Amino acid sequence: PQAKYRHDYRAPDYQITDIDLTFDLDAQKTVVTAVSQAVRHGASDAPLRLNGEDLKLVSVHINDEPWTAWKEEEGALVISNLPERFTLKIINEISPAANTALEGLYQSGDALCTQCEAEGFRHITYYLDRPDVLARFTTKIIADKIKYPFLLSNGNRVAQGELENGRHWVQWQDPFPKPCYLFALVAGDFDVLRDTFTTRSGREVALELYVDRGNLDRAPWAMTSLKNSMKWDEERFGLEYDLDIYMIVAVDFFNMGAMENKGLNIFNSKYVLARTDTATDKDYLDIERVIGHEYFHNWTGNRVTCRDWFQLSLKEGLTVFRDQEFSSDLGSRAVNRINNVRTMRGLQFAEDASPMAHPIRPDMVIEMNNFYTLTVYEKGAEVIRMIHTLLGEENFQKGMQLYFERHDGSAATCDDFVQAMEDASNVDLSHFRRWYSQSGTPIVTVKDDYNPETEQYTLTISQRTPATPDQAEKQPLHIPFAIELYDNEGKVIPLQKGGHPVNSVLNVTQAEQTFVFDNVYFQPVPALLCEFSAPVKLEYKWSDQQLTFLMRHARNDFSRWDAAQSLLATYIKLNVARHQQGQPLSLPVHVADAFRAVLLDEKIDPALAAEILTLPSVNEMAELFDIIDPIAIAEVREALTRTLATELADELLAIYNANYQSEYRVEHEDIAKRTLRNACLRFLAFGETHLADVLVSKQFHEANNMTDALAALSAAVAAQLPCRDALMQEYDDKWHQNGLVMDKWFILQATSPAANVLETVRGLLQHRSFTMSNPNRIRSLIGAFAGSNPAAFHAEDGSGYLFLVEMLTDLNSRNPQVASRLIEPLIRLKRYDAKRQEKMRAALEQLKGLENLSGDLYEKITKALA
Ligand SMILES: N[C@H](CC(=O)O)Cc1ccccc1
Ligand code: NA
Ligand code: NA
Ligand code: NA
Ligand code: NA
Ligand code: NA
Ligand code: NA
Ligand SMILES: [Zn+2]
Structure with a gap:
């Protein structure tokens, strides 16, 4: 399988303007007739090259003439000797019931449906399956009326009829030209x-x-x-x-x-x-986000689409930014920002340090389904948010307006978007464009100086991006670096120089530079990289007291959380080093005191409190270390939870009780209280055992919503409480027929700290609610084990790696996309100690030898073993 390169883009030799599709639908054999109106743009001797994968070609006509000047090649139908304008007709067969990969036209239970992004339409018919070819579609669907009473495609119904032998048909028309990745078909009973x-x-x-x-x-x-x-x-x-x-x-x-x-x-x-009995607060908010996300693509992705797949972030970064702005506007902006930052620092940074590192606009792709990534999506969105930071809301909207004015109805590039923003705003984004082309996480180092004689505060800021496996060359970026300076009373010191205000978003554009502020009447405590103003690692030599000061006084809630993160990071690193020497947890009293104060502060928003009281995940912890010790990290997380539970026991119980809510509402103030209550519950589960067991069992039984039930169940598992087995059985007995609800329970099994977790996980491959045919089940059991239980996954005996190899051996052939998602934990091997690397390398080498290795896995494996 061959790499493609961004720099090789060339406009297509042929365009299609209109396509008329007919589907004679049947699960075993579907017949597709596709009538396309085509136009030659290239040389008269260039052939038309259509993509196609696993199609049985029936016939090829050009203006109703059976065509002889064609050939089928690997992945293609190549049609020669064509006129400048013509009607292409292809008839071909496909088999939905055989499609286990779930790309193209496939079966979902008794329904038939499609997935065409990125390159799935070529699994339906021979086409110009590239997003710079936009055509007007009409879609006629013919099917068994009893099995498929609803026949749906894009746009509006224009025709319908009934046929003999119990078949009927519906024809759809969508007036907006589209790339074929935006085609859909659905047939079923709903x-x-x-x-x-x-x-x-x-x-x-x-x-x-x-x-x-x-x-x-x-x-x-x-x-x-x-x-x-x-x-x-x-x-x-x-x-x-x-x-x-x-x-x-x-x-x-x-x-x-x-x-x-x-x-x-x-x-x-x-x-x-x-x-309310099946879904948690987080599920409601994720529905909201994803509903929004797809909706937002109607403009950012559909009305303006992508020229080529290397431009994926044009739509994905921008649409993720939009879904975050939506969530943030309707809900708690601070909690959204916090959680998106946790994703960036704990999951995306890890990818940017991996063999699969790429810029938000990739330069090289083997299998494009491998580039629906944290980088393209979440780092993409941070890039768009940097533009917003640089421009301000009003100019950013002017940019959005210019982007649509120029590009509505066409396929565009990342560069076109940046250019719209620059031209509408008059802000120079030439240097900023380097964020699209450079992979890896920048490290920003800050040193400070206060001069009491001149009342000047100096920041010396430097940046570097370490080389990544894809790019030996790195350069400085245009880093928006937001700051706030606090006096001894917690008040903001105005930023100024030479008698003029200075914008608090510093333009960090060099390897090293100095910024000097005047009239700084007291030695400041800085808040640095405010609201995570660029997607960078910050290196500043904080004192613990500066951090606890920011926890109390910073004016944005994000900075209060972030300061607590920086405070904790120090002591996480301490305690991992201690664990490796056989020593128990050590924590200064003044650190515990800081979290006590958060629990007892009656003015703090409970949403903010809850997040400060939510420890960094084992994933976010891992990113603090050059070499990851996953057992130490998991044990230290537990020990820290235990120590805080013991030190803050009375306060935790008091806050737990104070936040009790008898009515369940999916409303932001209520969600916040409940998140705080359940954060308290997590610590209490790790306290004294008898009280823990009683509190958790009683919450599980008295809960009138799944948020509260699951938080209790999850705490019983995490703390290995006496009630755990009974509660887990109760949940299975009640919910085994419901796959989505059982996903939560599979995650808890997979992430359990119990010594026999792998045995239990393997046994659950036979569970009544599990099936290898269903990506959600796969992800909730196998994915959660490999990706969210790194302590077990990375068991010193290598058993976690062997289990994953076995599952991937099946999934490589069944559903490569899912396989490739699941291989990700193995491609991180260079972050681990030599003995683990060796075992992980051997696992990757076994996979490399698979018969019929998918391109999806090939790409990742070869990058990992390099
Ligand atoms: N644009 C879709 C999702 C999204 O970003 O809206 C991407 C996708 C690729 C492959 C399978 C399913 C979906
Ligand atoms: Na014609
Ligand atoms: Na076209
Ligand atoms: Na009707
Ligand atoms: Na809001
Ligand atoms: Na593929
Ligand atoms: Na089963
Ligand atoms: Zn999207």
């Missing part, structure tokens, strides 16, 4: 939740949510979120929906979260279905 939204200018939109029969009770929150998303995009971005119907279909078998097909989004049911 319950349909129907609603309407009226746009600001008066366009009436029919909203239709299709769910499996029996699930209408779980649909209203997703419908509500859709209306919320539509309203927000109008208020914040000035964007309205552009069609007459908005269809969402919830399917149980899906490789990612959801997909923005124009007017017909297809969602993993995990990001649709919610009831």
Whole structure:
């Protein structure tokens, strides 16, 4: 399998302007007829090269003439000797029931549905499967009326009929030209939740949510979120929906979260279905985010699409930024920002230090489905947020307006977007563009000096990005570096120099530079990299007292959390080193005191308190170390939880009780209180055993919502409490028929600290609720073990690696996309000690030798073994 390169992009020799599709649908054999209107742009002697994968070609006609001047090659149908304008007709067969990979046209339970992004449409017919070819689609679907009473595609229904032998048909038309990755088809039997939204200018939109029969009770929150998303995009971005119907279909078998097909989004049911007894606060908020996300793509991805797949972040970074702004505006902006920062520092930084490191606009790709990444999405969004920081809201919106004005109805590039922002705002983004081309995490080092004689404070800021495996050459970036200076009373010191105010977003553009501020009347405590203003590691030699001072006084809640993170990082690193020497946890009294104060502060927002009281995950902890010791990190996390539970026991119980709520509401103030209460509960579970067991068992039994039940169950597992086995059985007995709810329980099994966790996980491959055919089940059991239980995964005997090899051996052939997601923990081997590296390398070498190794795994394995 061959790498493709961004610098090799060239405009297509042929365009397709209009395609008429007919599907004679059947699970075993579907017949596709595709009539395309084509136009030659290249030389008269260039052939038309159509992509196709696993298609049985039936016939090829050019203007209704059976064509002889063609050949099939690996992945292609190459058609020679064509006129300048012509009608291409292809008939071909495919087999939905054989499609275990879930790319193209496949079966999800009894429904048929599609996934075409990135290069899945070529699994349906021979086409110009590239996103710079936009065509007007009409889609006629013919099927068994009893099995498939609903036949859906993009746009509006234009024709319908009934046939003999119990078949019927529906034809759809979408007036907006689209790349084929935005094509969708759905056939099946559903319950349909129907609603309407009226746009600001008066366009009436029919909203239709299709769910499996029996699930209408779980649909209203997703419908509500859709209306919320539509309203927000109008208020914040000035964007309205552009069609007459908005269809969402919830399917149980899906490789990612959801997909923005124009007017017909297809969602993993995990990001649709919610009831208060089945879904947690986090599930509700994730539904909200993902509903929003797909909706936001209607403009940022559909009305303006991607020229080529190396431009993926053009739509993904921007749409993730939008979904974060949506969540943040409707909910707690501080909690959103906190959680997105946790993702960046703990999951994305790790990728940027891995063999799979890439810039947000990649230069080289073997399998494009490997580049739907934390980098492209989350780091992408941080890049867009840097633009927002540099420009301000008003100029940023002017940029958005110019981007759409120039590019509406076309496929564009990352560079076009940056250019729109620069031209609308008059801010120079030439240097800033380097964020698109350079991989790896920059390290920003800050040193300070206060001069009492001149009342001047000097910051000396330096930047470096370490080389990555993809790029030996690194240069300085344009780093927006936001600061605030605090006096001894906690008040903000105005930033100024030579009698003029200085913007608090410093432009850090050199390897090293100095910034000098005047009229600094007291030695400052700085808040540095405010609201994580660039996606960088900060190196500043904080005292513990500066950090606890910021925890009390900083004016943005984010900085209060972030200071607590920096305080904890010191003592996490201490205690991991101690663990490796056989010594127990050591923590200064004044550190415990700082967290006590958070618990007892009656003015602090409980949302903020809850996050300060949520310890960094084992993933975020790992990023503090050059060499990861996953057992020490897991044990230190536990010991720190135990020590805090003991030291703060009375305060924890008092806050736990004070935040009791009898009514359950999916409302932000209530969510915050409950997050704080359950954060207290987690510590209390690790206190004295009898009280822990009683508190946790009683919460599990008395809970009137899954947030509270699951928090108790999760605490019983984590603390290995006496009640654990009974509670886990109770949950299985009640919920085994419900896969989404059982996912939570598989995660708890997979992430258990028990010594026999791997044995239990293997045994669960036979559980009544588990199946290797379902990506959600795979991810919740196997993925969670490998990715979220690094202590067990990285068991010194190598057993975790062997288990993953066995699962990947099946998944490589069944569902390579899922396989490639699951291999990620093994490609991190160079972060581990020599003995672990050796075992992980041997595991990778076994996988490299697989017969029929997928391109998906090949890419990652060869980068890892290099
Ligand atoms: N654009 C889709 C998701 C999203 O970012 O909206 C990407 C996707 C790729 C592969 C399978 C499913 C979905
Ligand atoms: Na013709
Ligand atoms: Na076109
Ligand atoms: Na009708
Ligand atoms: Na808000
Ligand atoms: Na593929
Ligand atoms: Na099973
Ligand atoms: Zn997206």
